[PDB]
């Protein structure tokens, strides 16, 4: 059975505290005159439950690429040149720490699964990561582009079958990275979905190692991947929409996504399995996390890891479910819990994104 | 063990005969005064070993989207809107014929793998296919974007482990589509990679069904997927390069790619496996790759027949091309009274390749027919 053997994360060094973003955003986009809009955007940042976000896109980067800060202006080439370089670099930072934890040589990896929705190139970010890390030429790459916030979960789904069907030697590095360079947009009166995305999206990278049939002398599972299944919510394609354009990516976030996602993953939870199991839910917004608490009647401690990653990092998209998994098993160990899943045995991870698409991973903890 | 249970293909109705393409291409781009450049382009087309290509991008579509035919003009938005709609539509045409040949209900599928380097969107082409085909919501989707001409083989590699690890009723639809709307560019005398790609790149869709441990009464494999491995060619990053830009995709094609590829897959054959006693499916990158296979392995001329055929009748369609060849090989083997689906031979190999340079090697096993 496939297991997660290591986790590690990385973030761009610059921190943006949510308190100061509504002024920073409207200032660098020369938009201070949209005061009524800014008041609305201040209202979104405060309700976001996000304390701080790490971002590559600093005021300097915008000055260097001034069209990114100018709505509808062509900025795709500029965004593209940044992301094609920087996405694999941030992925290398996290992958190195994850391989340090695994404690095995690079030449032991057989596969690489790279996921991002921040830039596209041929050869793609999976290749570039393998170059700058000097991976052997026998490492088999799978590139997951533009799958949004369920990419981290979908990587595990793919990794389970690769790891289990090829046997003991198969070892998979998974790397998910996002830079909101891809979709930063200046605020506008008619396009009210920016204010949502610009309040929540942030940058980060997470890496993980997956294998089955372990060398019990060197390798130790953190979690076991029991099952992994994707489902699609009918007639909801208008929920999350990403249009990649000459102005960069135009995202569109429907008001109904949190209730639609919330009702559906709460259903997946029942169909698949409530304070006796551990939970990793992609921090799409605070309302999805509350609905899990309200409809399953969870203690405040059940969603703690997911609220924590949201608060300290915001909505990093793809890699976010791995941040939460790392955060869960870390505090489990520091607090001396019974298991990597906060002392519990069974758990569930949910990724979700455009479609609407839900990726459900059934996990099992490891005794600590 | 995973097996290919059905294969089918589709292409745009408009046919562009290579003999006429230099005139067409320089006329619709209003570049016919670049007479020396056009002569060079004629020589490329005349050596392409491509007889005809099917293409979505007609003179009318250029007229409707004039920036596509103006070099460096902003046309990404125009290209995107075409491909986001037209890529799943053309994939649908192939997929339905593949399901028809399979003989099982569309609802019996469990997985969909969609591959294209022609447009990006969220939700992606895999979702849009599922929508317009009415695939049930339990069909689990994987989207392979921007992986170039090895995506068809990479889909078989991932589908092998999905079918065999889950097995049972697991059934994977693979759909690979390219439209050269993505990378069509007007000619320039400083940018001679464009002349190469404009002489060879074409449109098509292919669909295949994959499953392990199927029912003999209803389902019969065409090929068994014995193994599949991806390898990378070191220090070859600049061979095949695709820069997605506001002007569309700018590709760059090193002149040595066919030799690097040809020498690499000849070596892969030897490490992996009478070379005339196995069958071959080689991505039609150009004529030099196939001749290198024949030369360095001492192949009779029947061995690359199917790959030459697809190159001739369809050009370089990218990702789906190996499935076109696999289908052609299987069909003619049946029609011409051969003993197995691989031209009467037992073992075979499929090579896809693309940016990296990356090589996807799929070891195949024919099934007895006739
Ligand atoms: C931004 C957010 C935190 C605001 O908190 P909230 O729970 O909506 O609380 P409120 O209803 O009081 O705030 C909504 C305000 O922002 C606007 N707004 C919120 N969501 C919006 C959306 N999808 N589209 C357009 N406007 C939106 C509303 O128009 C409203 O404006 P108002 O102050 O004039 O009334 C919340 O909307 C959110 O988290 N959205 C993200 C949804 C999500 O998880 N998507 C998944 C992507 S991975
Ligand atoms: C275009 C092609 C059909 C003709 O090449 P050929 O059969 O080897 O014969 P030639 O070398 O005489 O080519 C004729 C012209 O094309 C030019 N040319 C060939 N490859 C070129 C390249 N990468 N870049 C720029 N020019 C090139 C030559 O300079 C020559 O110009 P000239 O006639 O004025 O001297 C052949 O180059 C080809 O198929 N290349 C494919 C590359 C490839 O497979 N890429 C993989 C993507 S899947």
Strand B111-116 and strand B358-366: pairing?
Answer: unpaired
Please answer whether residues A227 and A24 qualify as being in contact, where contact means their C-beta atoms are separated by less than 8 angstroms.
no
Query: Which residue's C-alpha comes closest to atom 48 of ligand 1?
Result: A284
The closest ligand to the CA of A147 turns out to be 1
Query: Ligand 2: which atom is nearest the Cα of residue B283?
Result: 48
Architecture of domain A222-367: 3-Layer(aba) Sandwich (3.40)
A152 φψ region: left (φ > 0), alpha (ψ -120 to 50), beta (else): alpha
- On the 0-12 / 13-18 / 19+ scale of CB atoms within 10 A, A198 is buried
- On the 0-12 / 13-18 / 19+ scale of CB atoms within 10 A, A217 is exposed
Strand partners, B208: B7, B174
Q: Does residue A125 line the site of ligand 1, with CB under 6 A?
A: no
CA distance B83 to B81: 6
How many CA atoms, within 13 angstroms, populate the side-chain half-sphere of residue A310?
A: 24
Closest CA to B226 of B365, B20, B19: B365
**Chain B residues near residue A121 by CB distance under 8 angstroms:** 146, 242-244
CA distance B277 to B264: 20
Contacts 24+ apart (CB under 8 A), A336-342: A336/A368, A337/A368, A338/A367, A338/A368, A339/A365, A339/A366, A339/A367, A339/A368, A340/A222, A340/A223, A340/A365, A340/A366, A340/A368, A341/A223, A341/A277, A341/A278, A341/A365, A342/A278, A342/A301, A342/A305
- On the 0-12 / 13-18 / 19+ scale of CB atoms within 10 A, B285 is buried
**Chain B residues near residue A157 by CB distance under 8 angstroms:** 140
Among A79, A226, A232, pick the best mutation site for testing chain B contact (most B Cβ within 10 A): A232
Q: At what angle do helices B76-102 and B125-133 cross, to 10 degrees?
A: 50
Instruction: Tell me if A120 and B160 make a contact (CB, 8 A cut-off).
Output: no
CA distance A250 to B45: 39
CA distance B10 to B12: 7
CA distance B147 to B123: 18
Instruction: Tell me if B355 and A123 make a contact (CB, 8 A cut-off).
Output: yes
The DSSP secondary-structure symbol of A319 reads T
CA-nearest residue of chain B to A234? B137
Verify cis geometry, omega within 30 degrees of 0, for the bond prior to B357: yes
Closest CA to B76 of A243, A191, A197: A243
* Residue B273, CA distances (Å) to A64, B57, B278, B297 in order: 54, 42, 10, 12
Q: To the nearest whole angstrom, how far is the Cα of A116 from the nearest Cα of chain B?
A: 11
Closest CA to A29 of A18, A21, A40, A17: A21
Q: Centre a 10 Å sphere on the Cβ of residue A229 and count the other Cβ atoms it contains.
A: 15
Strand partners, B115: B144, B176
CA-nearest residue of chain B to A78? B245
Q: Which residues of A28-53 are buried (b: 16+ CB within 10 A; e: fewer)?
A: bbebeebeebbeebbebbeebbbebb
Q: Does residue A289 line the site of ligand 1, with CB under 6 A?
A: no
Q: To the nearest whole angstrom, how far is the Cα of A237 from the nearest Cα of chain B?
A: 7
Query: Which candidate from A147, A246, A357 shows the least CB-CB separation from B74?
Result: A246
Can you say how many angstroms the Cα of residue A67 is from the centroid of all Cα atoms in its chain?
27
Q: Centre a 10 Å sphere on the Cβ of residue A137 and count the other Cβ atoms it contains.
A: 13
Can you say how many angstroms the Cα of residue A352 is from the centroid of all Cα atoms in its chain?
10
**Chain B residues near residue A156 by CB distance under 8 angstroms:** none
Strand B52-54 and strand B15-17: pairing?
Answer: antiparallel
CA distance B359 to A5: 29
List every span in chain B annotated with CATH 3.40.47.10: 1-221, 222-368
Q: To the nearest whole angstrom, how far is the Cα of A362 from the nearest Cα of chain B?
A: 15
- On the 0-12 / 13-18 / 19+ scale of CB atoms within 10 A, B300 is exposed
Element (H, E) at B102: helix B76-102
Ligand 1 centre distance from Cα of residue B95 (Å): 40
The DSSP secondary-structure symbol of B51 reads -
Verify cis geometry, omega within 30 degrees of 0, for the bond prior to B157: no
**Chain A residues near residue B138 by CB distance under 8 angstroms:** 231
- What is the CATH class of A1-221? alpha beta
Q: Does residue A318 line the site of ligand 1, with CB under 6 A?
A: no
Tokens, residue B188 = 């320039």
Element (H, E) at B141: strand B140-145
Instruction: Tell me if A230 and B148 make a contact (CB, 8 A cut-off).
Output: no
Instruction: Tell me if A154 and B142 make a contact (CB, 8 A cut-off).
Output: yes
List every span in chain A annotated with CATH 3.40.47.10: 1-221, 222-367
Please answer whether residues A99 and A219 qualify as being in contact, where contact means their C-beta atoms are separated by less than 8 angstroms.
no
**Which residues form ligand 2's pocket by a CB distance below 6 Å?**
B 40, 43-44, 47-48, 149, 192-193, 196, 199-200, 240, 253-255, 257-258, 285-288, 316
Instruction: Tell me if B232 and A127 make a contact (CB, 8 A cut-off).
Output: yes
Of B45, B149, B176, B183, which one is the catalytic site residue?
B149
* Residue A241, CA distances (Å) to A114, A254, A354 in order: 22, 9, 6
Strand partners, A241: A252
Q: What are the start-end ranges of the H helices in chain A? A: 21-28, 35-47, 59-64, 76-102, 125-132, 151-166, 193-200, 257-272, 286-296, 304-313, 320-334
Q: Centre a 10 Å sphere on the Cβ of residue B216 and count the other Cβ atoms it contains.
A: 7
Among B232, B247, B253, B355, pick the best mutation site for testing chain A contact (most A Cβ within 10 A): B232
- What is the CATH class of B222-368? alpha beta
Query: Would you say the C-alpha torsion A243, A244, A250, A256 has a positive or negative sign?
Result: positive
Is position B115 annotated as part of the catalytic site?
Answer: no
Q: What are the start-end ranges of the H helices in A201-285? A: 257-272
Please answer whether residues A268 and A350 qualify as being in contact, where contact means their C-beta atoms are separated by less than 8 angstroms.
yes
CA distance A206 to B151: 25
CA distance B370 to B365: 16
CA distance B53 to A11: 47
Tokens, residue B25 = 């291409």
**Chain A residues near residue B142 by CB distance under 8 angstroms:** 144, 154, 158
Instruction: Tell me if A241 and B141 make a contact (CB, 8 A cut-off).
Output: no
Strand partners, B9: B206
Query: Ligand 2: which atom is nearest the Cα of residue B316?
Result: 48
Instruction: Tell me if A237 and B80 make a contact (CB, 8 A cut-off).
Output: no
């Amino acid at each position: 059975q496939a297991a997660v053997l290591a986790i590690a994360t990385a973030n761009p060094p610059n921190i943006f505290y949510q308190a100061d973003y509504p002024d920073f955003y409207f200032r660098v986009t020369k938009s201070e005159h949209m005061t009524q809009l800014k008041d609305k955007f201040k209202r979104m940042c405060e309700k976001s439950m996000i304390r701080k976000r790490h971002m590559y896109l600093t005021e300097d980067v915008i000055k260097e690429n001034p069209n990114i800060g100018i709505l509808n202006a062509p900025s795709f080439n500029a965004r593209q040149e940044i992301m094609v370089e920087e996405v694999p670099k941030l992925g290398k930072e996290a992958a190195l720490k994850a391989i340090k934890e695994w404690g095995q040589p690079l030449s032991k990896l057989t596969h690489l699964i790279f996921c991002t929705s921040s830039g596209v190139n041929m050869p793609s970010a999976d290749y570039h990561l393998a170059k700058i890390m000097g991976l052997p030429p026998y490492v088999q790459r799978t590139m997951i582009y533009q799958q949004g916030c369920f990419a981290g979960a979908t990587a595990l789904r793919l990794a389970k079958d690769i790891a289990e069907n090829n046997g003991g030697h198969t070892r998979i590095l998974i790397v998910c990275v996002e830079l909101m360079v891809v979709c930063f947009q200046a605020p506008s009166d008619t396009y009210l979905d920016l204010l949502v995305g610009n309040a929540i999206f942030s940058d980060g990278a997470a890496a993980a190692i997956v294998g089955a049939d372990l060398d019990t002398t060197t390798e130790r599972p953190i979690f076991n991947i029991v099952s992994a299944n994707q489902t699609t919510i009918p007639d909801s394609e208008d929920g999350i929409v990403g249009h990649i354009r000459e102005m960069g990516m135009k995202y569109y976030l429907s008001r109904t996504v949190p209730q639609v996602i919330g009702n559906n993953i709460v259903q997946c939870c029942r169909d698949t399995f409530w304070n006796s199991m551990f939970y990793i839910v992609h921090p799409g917004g605070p309302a999805v996390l509350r609905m899990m608490e309200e409809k399953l009647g969870l203690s405040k401690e059940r969603m703690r890891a997911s609220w924590h990653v949201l608060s300290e990092y915001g909505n990093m998209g793809g890699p976010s479910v791995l941040f939460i998994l790392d955060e869960m098993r870390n505090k489990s160990m520091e607090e001396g819990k019974s298991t990597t899943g906060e002392g519990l045995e069974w758990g569930v991870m949910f990724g979700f994104g455009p479609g609407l698409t839900v990726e459900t991973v059934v996990l099992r903890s490891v005794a600590i």
